Design brief:
The structure holds two protein chains of two kinds.
Chain A lengths: L5 E9 L6 E13 L2 E13 L2 E3 L2 E8 L2 E3 L2 E3 L2 E5 L6 E2 L2 E3 L1 E4 L13
Parallel strand pairs in A: 1-2, 2-3, 2-4, 3-5, 3-6, 4-7, 5-8, 6-9, 7-10, 8-11
Chain B lengths: L1 E8 L2 E4 L6 E4 L4 E2 L7 E4 L6 E4 L13 E8 L13 E7 L4 E7 L2 E7 L5 E7 L13 E8 L4 E6 L2 E7 L11 E7 L7 E10 L5 H10 L21 E4 L6 E4 L8 E4 L4 E4 L3 E4 L6 E6 L13 E9 L2 E6 L9 E2 L1 E3 L10 E7 L5 E9 L5 E10 L2 E7 L1 H7 L9 E4 L10
Antiparallel strand pairs in B: 1-2, 1-16, 3-6, 4-5, 5-16, 6-15, 7-12, 7-16, 8-9, 8-15, 9-10, 10-11, 12-13, 13-14, 17-31, 18-19, 20-21, 22-23, 23-24, 23-27, 24-26, 25-30, 27-28, 28-29, 29-30
Classes of the chains: A mainly beta, B mainly beta.
Bound molecules: a molecule of 3 linked components (NAG-NAG-FUC) and 2-acetamido-2-deoxy-beta-D-glucopyranose (2 copies).
A molecule of 3 linked components (NAG-NAG-FUC) sits at the interface of chains B and A.
GO cellular component, one term (chain B): host cell cytoplasmic vesicle
Subcellular location (chain B): Host cytoplasm, Host cytosol; Host cytoplasmic vesicle, Host secretory vesicle, Host synaptic vesicle membrane; Host synapse, Host presynaptic cell membrane; Secreted
GO biological process, one term (chain B): proteolysis
Amino acid sequence: YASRTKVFPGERVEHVTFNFTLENQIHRGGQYFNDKFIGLRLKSVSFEDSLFEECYFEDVTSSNTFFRNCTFINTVFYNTDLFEYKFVNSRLINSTFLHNKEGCPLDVTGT
Amino acid sequence: TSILSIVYKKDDLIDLSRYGAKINIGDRVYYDSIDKNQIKLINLESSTIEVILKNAIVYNSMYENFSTSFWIKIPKYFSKINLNNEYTIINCIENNSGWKVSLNYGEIIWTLQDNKQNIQRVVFKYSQMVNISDYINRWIFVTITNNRLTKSKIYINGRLIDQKPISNLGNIHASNKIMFKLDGCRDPRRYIMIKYFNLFDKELNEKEIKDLYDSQSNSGILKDFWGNYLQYDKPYYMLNLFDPNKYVDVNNIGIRGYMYLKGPRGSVVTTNIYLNSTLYEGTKFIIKKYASGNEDNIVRNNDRVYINVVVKNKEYRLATNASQAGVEKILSALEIPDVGNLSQVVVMKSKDDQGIRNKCKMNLQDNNGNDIGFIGFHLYDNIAKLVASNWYNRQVGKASRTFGCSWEFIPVDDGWGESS
Ligand SMILES: *[C@@H]1O[C@H](CO[C@@H]2O[C@@H](C)[C@@H](O)[C@@H](O)[C@@H]2O)[C@@H](O[C@@H]2O[C@H](CO)[C@@H](O)[C@H](O)[C@H]2NC(C)=O)[C@H](O)[C@H]1NC(C)=O
Ligand SMILES: *[C@@H]1O[C@H](CO)[C@@H](O)[C@H](O)[C@H]1NC(C)=O
Ligand SMILES: *[C@@H]1O[C@H](CO)[C@@H](O)[C@H](O)[C@H]1NC(C)=O
């Protein structure tokens, strides 16, 4: 499985509402400005060295997903299960979590 | 007993004491609309309040006791530019001797200096990772008493917070001039608010300090979450002190529908700076005049009012059916013209029967002037449904601990910065 992981080094998304369902990906060095993430599932998706800056996360279901060395600025996490263990060595600035989904406080896998 | 006391008057600031201290005010000092007796200072050079005493009251003695008291409202520190940045807000130092009041990240500092440059500092520390704070962006009654023989003490809201011996300090010669201005603050978007600055020539005891706290609290008028006047025709988010992780919500609109406490609350975070709880969650509560004889918009004690509930940007009315089963009358949100004769008039309370100041309580009443009871919450099958009950009145009569009948009104404030 780990042998099939796709990697996208370097991305610059700006002003788009962007949903999906992606599995087994790694994003490294992305830079998102004023983006909307509505109703997306994340399985084994890892964001690395990213910047989110006035982003907006709504109805996000996360299955083994992490944000490492990521920076969030004026972002909103509305109705998402992105708990505090999915931000590894991150920095949030003026970020807001609202209507957090119910779930475990530790990564339990969603097989 | 008071030597300096800055209060407001007709488009100026004066000193009530019989000394007539000259006050010089910058061209960028602001005032509130409603309580113009509260003063705002921002981070510029023109934001200046300069008060000058007389030579007959200059602190230059060996064992003279003195005290000061004031109210301060400090906004939330938002970024890491605010860390390790002690800035002075009140200054009384000439030739490296005197007293000063300074603020740092989550601190209020009292400092003394003698002519031998000895430093004694007394600090009140408030955390900013707390879920709900009593000090961030809320009015604080700060009073400092200095006993030249024993020790120096800082009092927050009437209670002793810190004390440090000052017996080693020998001679303090404070300045003739007192300066109210931010000094040394690297944040260009930083300000404070102060009100009711008083000076005394004796160390006040706990009795005198509590008397002063109560006298300056204006117990006859309701206060909102930030400690300002409560006002009609203004949206307020609602916080229950007994269960502060939940916010008022409705599910339906009508006689059948009910309003309850839903949770948990969200959070607003800036890593390593603040991890508070969201205060702009739930349904707003507008208060409308019913029988207020006062011309102003201020909500005072025993004012019979109406309560409008803002649901989906439309106004509804907070009422109950008095004649129902049980003691707990469940609160519901109704069409404003379709309320009929349902009990809606709320008597707003600021202080108790004995006059002891407490938080906001709402007393739902019918058209016959009969007390349905204090508005609170009662759990039905694990739903904390909002009710009006006389049980709270019974505990108040028995001087028991009422559970859930005390509320806070939270408007949108610039000093909190939450994204609504
Ligand atoms: C973090 O936010 C504060 C508060 O600003 C509010 O909250 C933001 C999330 C956003 O919704 C703003 O539009 C809100 O007004 C910022 O401090 C204020 O910033 C405004 C400009 O945005 C400025 O006019 C004020 O003077 C600032 N007030 C104070 C007390 O500093 C702050 O800048 C944000 N943090 C960072 C690091 O930029
Ligand atoms: C969500 O994703 C699907 C497929 O990825 C897309 O067709 C749909 O338009 C998206 N939702 C919205 C609101 O655009
Ligand atoms: C991510 O890369 C390294 C940490 O491995 C760090 O030096 C860098 O500043 C990080 N980038 C951001 C935007 O935080």
